[PDB]
Structures are given as structure tokens and as C-alpha cells.
């Protein structure tokens, strides 16, 4: 019986992986870090409030110049903002208002977005005509688009509610790689600093490390009790953090193939909607359903501070590439920039 | 003062963008958003003909209201990860097809289609994101109902039913079974209409449920409710 032989190997293999990981558990982060001075209290202030959206903000993405942002809301609009001056640079009407994700290309030439239309639309921000236009619509997913990230101007990585992730060739409009293996809706993507790997999170309460060029899952990380809503990479690319509906964040090390640290508190029963790291990786920031963003000391799991100031669910966080500022967006229709 | 000629121009452009965002805001505010749900192939596709891969939008105008209907079916994904984006709607239109009482789900021979319909109704009706959003419930394929019940009494799916095999009573029983799933009767209303898959007043039914919702909303904004 082929079915039983394969099921028996799968259980044995699950046990080998579990033990291979226990074999590496000679420390936790939380103990090697006992002799590290705490970051102390981190008190950030709102420096800018970006007003203009008339609806819940679902997505944010900082451009690479640390000055421009793209934000998306249920207004059916993307807004390109000048974070220093509080100016609208562009406002882009969408064909579908049901937008859940957006992304700024590293070059600043393109903006991606989409959501319940199951399409990732790519907008060209730099045209001869002087207007932002759709250059390409990428269709193929059968579920909602939960997250977009650009690798370069011709490549966009998407994740969706159809349980898969995909790598698209923007110029041909074709999907070149399909990344399968999740069983639940995929909620988020995070690209490695070198673009070669990406980590996806899903409603499987698991996250997977994918090999972008191979179209292969390399590592599966578990530990959450519930759906993972947000993922980001630790700046050097060897770890990632994830946030879920079980109201915790978890740090995972890719070489250890283990959960390294849990960030939680007895008074938080809210899900995590967004996670990000500061440049040194010392601070972990997370947006919560309680309308606050917590700042965690990533090497201790202490709460370093709180960014309070939204009147509704924090839907998204972003940190600039130069580390100068943190932007938070929320369901109260505002974006705020903190320093 | 302070700003360069180009920075001043950039500010002027930003201000024009704000004016345009506000005008679109006002237009959107006037439109009526309707979420269209239903128990699979429950006559949903007939209602949209009269009220004419991902989410499908339908635009419709009647008595100067501009309606926008969102058909969110055919999204075989978890509602808990997207249904909240529809929190801000005027009403939910929910389609149930009464002839379903003697049917079972293709995927589960022991699961009555009508109970599957009630389970969905309850998941939406008592959802935390829709606690003040009214429901317009349409009972479809009534002509088919009315004839089947003369051969197959309701008990088939409602063993406790003790009325006659009369569609007026059987239909009332089904209506009650759905209205009693409302655990927030003092907050959200359920408007029930029998469309029979033949009526032409289905548009009017939505219109009137909608104007009643709008007046309650104005009474709340006026500080009267």
C-alpha cells in the first residue's frame, strides 16, 4: 500500500525535523542576551500627519529614497506622498476599490497594487504624457491578492488567497513561477535583502522560506497558534519575524530552523497586523488591533515603547531605508510619521 | 515666503489633488453600497439581472439613487480575512432559494441545502463587522417551492414543522426560521421579500429597504435617534 508507506515516512520525517531542531536548542535568544543593556524607553513623536484618504488605509510602502510613500485605501486610490513636505505627488484612481496591498518599486518607476479583484496592477509613474497609467495587469491568481513586492522593475512577487505565491514577469505579463505548499490563504510576503529568498505567511499558522529562482520551499516554520498576518526580515537576512492573530510576534532563525524568541504580553489580546524592524534590527515594531504600535526590544522581548495616536486599527507599518522614520497607517484614514 | 518657486508650485499641485479627492469623496458618499451574498446558486443570478475572476461589481440607478452592488461570491477563500472590508455598506442582500428545502449539498449528501443556507445567514447576520447593517433577504424560486411542498412537506428539513402543506404557511415558517437567527433584533432589521423568481418589484423592494436605512442613519447624524 503506497498510501500507507508514504504516510509512515511523512510522520517519521516530521519527527526527524523536530528532533533535529531540538538538538540545536542549547540556548535561547533570551538568555544569551541577558548581559545586554536594554534599549531603554523609546519615545517617538509624530512629526507628520498625512491627511487625504477618506477611507480605511490598508497598505503602505516606503520608496527607497526614504522620502516618498505610497499608500492605498478603500477610496480606490493610491497616493504618492512627499513625507518631508506633506505633499501629494500623485493620486492614482483604481479600477477596483478593494485594494489590500501596494508596493513601490525600488527604482521609483512603478507602483503595484490590488486586492479582491485577484489582479496585481502595475502603474507607471514616469510617463511622457505626465500622468500615471496602468502599464500591466497581472491576472492568474484565483484568490484575493494579499501582498505585492517588487524584486526589480520587471519582476513582482505576489501572494494570494488561493494559497499560492507567484513570481511574475511584468513585461510578458506571465507568471513564471508558482510557489505552492501552503494550505491556507497567504497573508504576507517579505523579501530577503538580496532578493533571492522570500518568506510567506499564511492562515496555516506557518511560514515558509522560498527559493525564488528554484520555485521551491526550503524551510517550514511553525509556532503560531493562529493565522500569520505579517512578516518581515531581520535586516541581515538570517531571520524573520512574524505577527499573528494569537497576539504574539515570533522571531525565527533560518539557519537554526527554529523559533528563537516570542514577543508577547499579558495585556495584549489583539492581533498583529503589521511588523517591521529598525536598521540595526534592535527594535521590532508591531501594529495591533488595539490601535497602538508597540516597539519591542528585539533582543529581549521587552516593550521599549508605544506609538499611540491612531483612533482605529493600525493596518500597516513601514520604516524608511535609512532608518530615519516610522510611518504608521490605520483605519482612521490617516498616516503618521514618527521619529 | 521661504519656499522656492518650484516648491510653491509643488504645493499648488498638492492642493489641486486635495480638491479632486474631496469631490470624489462626496460622490462616493452619495452612492449606496450593497453587499450581495447568498447560499450558492440561490437565485442570486436572477436578482442581478433585474438590478443590473474576483469581486464583481454592478451599477444600478433607480429613483435617483445610485447603487453599487458587490457580488463577493466565487471567492473560495476565508471570509474572516476580507469580509471586514465591507463593514461600511448600507445593506446586505442575502439570497436564499426556498425550493432548496428538499435538497442536499452535492459535497455532503446528509447536509440539507436549506440548513447550509441558514448557517451562512447566521455567520453574516451575527458577524461582528455587521452589527448595524441591515439585511434584505430574498426568498427565491418560490413558484418551484409552492409546487414541491404539495409532494414533499417541509418536515423533510424541518421535522418540527406542524403546519399544513400550504405555501403561505410553509413560506412563513421558513421566513421565521431565518429571522430568528437575528441575535441583534433591536439593532438591525431584516427585510424579507418573496421574489418568487418572477416578480419585477425586486428593485423596489431594495429601494425601500434602503431609504429606511438612510433615514435611520440621518436620524443618528441629526442627533435625534
Amino acid at each position: 500500500s503506497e498510501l500507507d508507506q508514504l504516510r509512515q515516512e511523512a510522520e517519521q520525517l516530521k519527527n526527524q525535523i523536530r528532533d533535529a531542531r531540538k538538538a540545536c536548542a542549547d540556548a535561547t535568544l533570551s538568555q544569551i542576551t541577558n548581559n545586554i543593556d536594554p534599549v531603554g524607553r523609546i519615545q517617538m513623536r509624530t512629526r507628520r500627519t498625512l491627511r487625504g484618504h477618506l477611507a480605511k488605509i490598508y497598505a503602505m510602502h516606503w520608496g527607497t529614497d526614504s522620502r516618498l510613500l505610497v499608500s492605498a485605501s478603500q477610496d480606490g486610490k493610491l497616493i504618492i506622498w512627499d513625507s518631508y513636505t506633506t505633499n501629494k505627488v500623485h493620486a492614482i484612481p483604481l479600477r477596483s476599490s478593494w485594494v489590500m496591498t501596494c508596493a513601490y518599486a525600488p527604482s521609483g518607476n512603478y507602483v503595484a497594487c490590488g486586492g479582491l479583484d485577484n489582479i496585481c496592477s502595475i502603474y507607471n509613474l514616469k510617463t511622457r504624457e505626465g500622468n500615471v497609467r496602468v502599464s500591466r495587469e497581472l491576472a492568474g491568481h484565483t484568490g484575493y491578492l494579499s501582498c505585492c513586492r517588487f524584486l526589480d522593475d520587471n519582476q513582482i512577487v505576489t501572494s494570494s488567497g488561493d494559497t499560492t505565491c507567484a513570481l511574475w514577469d511584468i513585461e510578458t505579463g506571465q507568471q513564471t513561477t508558482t510557489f505552492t505548499g501552503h494550505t491556507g490563504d497567504v497573508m504576507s510576503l517579505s523579501l530577503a535583502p538580496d532578493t533571492r529568498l522570500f518568506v510567506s505567511g499564511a492562515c496555516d499558522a506557518s511560514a515558509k522560506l522560498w527559493d525564488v529562482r528554484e520555485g521551491m520551499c526550503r524551510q517550514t516554520f511553525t509556532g503560531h497558534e493562529s493565522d500569520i498576518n505579517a512578516i518581515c526580515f531581520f535586516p541581515n537576512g538570517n531571520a524573520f519575524a512574524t505577527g499573528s492573530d494569537d497576539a504574539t510576534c515570533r522571531l525565527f532563525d533560518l539557519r537554526a530552523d527554529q523559533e528563537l524568541m516570542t514577543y508577547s504580553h499579558d495585556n495584549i489580546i489583539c492581533g498583529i497586523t503589521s511588523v517591521s524592524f529598525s536598521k540595526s534590527g534592535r527594535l521590532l515594531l508591531a501594529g495591533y488591533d488595539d490601535f497602538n504600535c508597540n516597539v519591542w526590544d528585539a533582543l529581549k522581548a521587552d516593550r521599549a515603547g508605544v506609538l499611540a495616536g491612531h483612533d482605529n486599527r493600525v493596518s500597516c507599518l513601514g520604516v524608511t531605508d535609512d532608518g530615519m522614520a516610522v510611518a504608521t497607517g490605520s483605519w482612521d484614514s490617516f498616516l503618521k510619521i514618527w521619529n | 515666503c521661504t519656499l522656492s518657486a518650484e516648491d510653491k508650485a509643488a504645493v499648488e499641485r498638492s492642493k489641486m489633488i486635495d480638491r479632486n479627492l474631496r469631490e470624489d469623496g462626496e460622490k462616493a458618499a452619495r452612492e449606496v453600497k450593497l453587499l450581495l451574498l447568498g447560499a450558492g446558486e440561490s437565485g442570486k443570478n436572477t436578482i442581478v439581472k433585474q438590478m443590473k475572476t474576483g469581486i464583481v461589481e454592478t451599477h444600478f440607478t433607480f429613483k435617483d439613487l445610485h447603487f453599487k452592488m458587490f457580488d463577493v461570491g466565487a471567492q473560495r477563500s476565508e471570509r474572516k480575512k476580507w469580509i471586514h472590508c465591507f463593514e461600511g455598506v448600507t445593506a446586505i442582500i442575502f439570497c436564499v432559494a426556498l425550493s432548496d428545502y428538499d435538497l442536499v449539498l452535492a459535497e455532503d449528501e446528509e447536509m440539507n441545502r436549506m440548513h447550509a443556507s441558514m448557517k451562512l445567514f447566521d455567520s453574516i447576520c451575527n458577524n461582528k463587522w455587521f452589527t448595524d447593517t441591515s439585511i434584505i433577504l430574498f426568498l427565491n424560486k418560490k413558484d418551484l417551492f409552492e409546487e414541491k411542498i404539495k409532494k414533499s412537506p417541509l418536515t423533510i428539513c424541518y421535522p418540527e414543522y406542524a403546519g399544513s402543506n400550504t405555501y403561505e404557511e410553509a413560506a412563513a415558517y421558513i421566513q421565521c426560521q431565518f429571522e430568528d437567527l437575528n441575535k441583534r433584533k433591536d439593532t438591525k432589521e431584516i427585510y424579507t421579500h418573496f421574489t418568487c423568481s418572477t416578480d419585477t418589484k425586486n428593485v423596489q423592494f431594495v429601494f425601500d429597504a434602503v431609504t429606511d436605512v438612510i433615514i435611520k442613519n440621518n436620524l443618528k447624524d441629526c442627533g435625534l435617534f
Partner: single-chain antibody, 234 residues
Framework: DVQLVESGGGLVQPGGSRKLSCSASGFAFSSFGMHWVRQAPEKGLEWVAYISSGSGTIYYADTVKGRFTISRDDPKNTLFLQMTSLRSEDTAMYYC??????????????WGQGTTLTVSSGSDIVMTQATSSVPVTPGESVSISCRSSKSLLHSNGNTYLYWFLQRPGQSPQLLIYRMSNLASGVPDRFSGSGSGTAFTLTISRLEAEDVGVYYCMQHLEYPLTFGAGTKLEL
């Protein structure tokens, strides 16, 4: 492609008036500010007037202010200059210039072809381009300098210097904006550098197609001003 066509030029007697028109096509006209720029028979360029997008603001050069009126009609994609009490000093080629302002934009990146108006019988920043002409053997580099009477460096970090090239028989082309940014379509043979009040346009490996007059413009304050222009020769 992007197009601006000037028309309505011709011969007028002094004291009379004309209306110049400029038809735009190929672009989102209503989103662009527009300028009129004159080129005298002496070939210096002079800014005449600016109409912002949305017609929020209008600026005029002091010599035309009160005489010329600049207007826009977005639904037909056109600009106009209503020119009253024309004097012979007003003889020039009149060009429409497209300009859009936002962070990271490239203003003055498209010029029309101009129409010709022939009329019978301050605290301004002065840009000076000492050299009038420079012969350069093709294949060798070029250095074109420009000085300003005022620093063009604003406290926001931007230096508002623009360089334009006018090839014989052609309207001016933007080469460099804000000191060092190349305009789209401009080869990497061109490079800008400098600071304060001293600026340089560097050309590496000159091509025959690069021969024409190089104009220096400041955009720190209105009136916008141009330098004399250095003619590259050979």
C-alpha cells in the same frame, strides 16, 4: 508623441495686437504649467509668462506685464497670449514650454517649435555665460561655464540651475535640471556640476549632434532668467 504647436504669428504694425495660440496634444495638458519663452533675433532667450496648472497663478516678465495676458483653455488643450500694444522690441520667436512641478519632476522638458512674431518699426538674478563661442574638435571634451549673481542653492538642498541646448533650426532641448540631473533622452555624454554661484556643463567626447547654443537658466525665483548662451562650434 508629445506635441506643442504654436500658431498665430505673422506681421503686425506697432501699437497693434495679436493673439498667439498653442495647441497641445499627446499629453495630459491640464496637469502641466505652461510658459512662454521668447527668442530674440539676437538669439537670447527670455522668459515671458507663466500660467500654472489649474490657472492658480500667473507671472509675467516685467517688460510684458500689463501688456500681454497669458491664458489657458484646458478643454481644448490650448494656450494663448493676448499681446496688446506691440512694439518692435517684441519681435521674437515665441515658444510654448511644458512644465510640471512635483517632487522629482523635470520642468521645461518639452518645447514647441515656435511661431514668429514680427513687429514693424531690478533684483533679478543675472546669469552670465561669459564665453560667447567655443570651437571644439569633435571627439574631444567641452567645458561650458555659467555664473550667477545670486546663489542658486536653496535651503531645501536644491540648486535651481537648468541647462538647455538649441541646435540650429530647432527649439531648445532640456539637458540638465537642478544642476546635475539629466533629462530623459539625454545621453551620458552630458554631465552637470558646480555649486553656489559657479556652474559647469561638461560634455565628454563631443559628437557633431551636440553642436549648438548652450543656455543657462535659473529657476529660483521669478522672473526666470537665462544667460547669454555659448555657441559650441565645429
Amino acid at each position: 508623441d508629445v506635441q506643442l504647436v504654436e500658431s498665430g504669428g505673422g506681421l503686425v504694425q506697432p501699437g497693434g495686437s495679436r493673439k498667439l495660440s498653442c495647441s497641445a496634444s499627446g499629453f495630459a495638458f491640464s496637469s502641466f504649467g505652461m510658459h512662454w519663452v521668447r527668442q530674440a533675433p539676437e538669439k537670447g532667450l527670455e522668459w515671458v509668462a507663466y500660467i500654472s496648472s489649474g490657472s492658480g497663478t500667473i507671472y509675467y516678465a516685467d517688460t510684458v506685464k500689463g501688456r500681454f495676458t497669458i491664458s489657458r483653455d484646458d478643454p481644448k488643450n490650448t494656450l494663448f497670449l493676448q499681446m496688446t500694444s506691440l512694439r518692435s522690441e517684441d519681435t521674437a520667436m515665441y515658444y510654448c514650454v511644458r512644465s510640471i512641478y512635483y517632487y522629482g519632476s523635470s520642468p521645461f522638458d518639452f518645447w514647441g517649435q515656435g511661431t514668429t512674431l514680427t513687429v514693424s518699426s531690478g533684483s533679478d538674478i543675472v546669469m552670465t555665460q561669459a564665453t560667447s563661442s567655443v570651437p571644439v574638435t569633435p571627439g574631444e571634451s567641452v567645458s561650458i561655464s555659467c555664473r550667477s549673481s545670486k546663489s542658486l542653492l536653496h535651503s531645501n538642498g536644491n540648486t535651481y540651475l537648468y541647462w538647455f541646448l538649441q541646435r540650429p533650426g530647432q527649439s531648445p532641448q532640456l539637458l540638465i535640471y537642478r544642476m546635475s540631473n539629466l533629462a530623459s533622452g539625454v545621453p551620458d555624454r552630458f554631465s552637470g556640476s558646480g555649486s553656489g554661484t559657479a556652474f559647469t556643463l561638461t560634455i565628454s567626447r563631443l559628437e557633431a549632434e551636440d553642436v549648438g547654443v548652450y543656455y543657462c537658466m535659473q529657476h529660483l525665483e521669478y522672473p526666470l532668467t537665462f544667460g547669454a548662451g555659448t555657441k559650441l562650434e565645429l
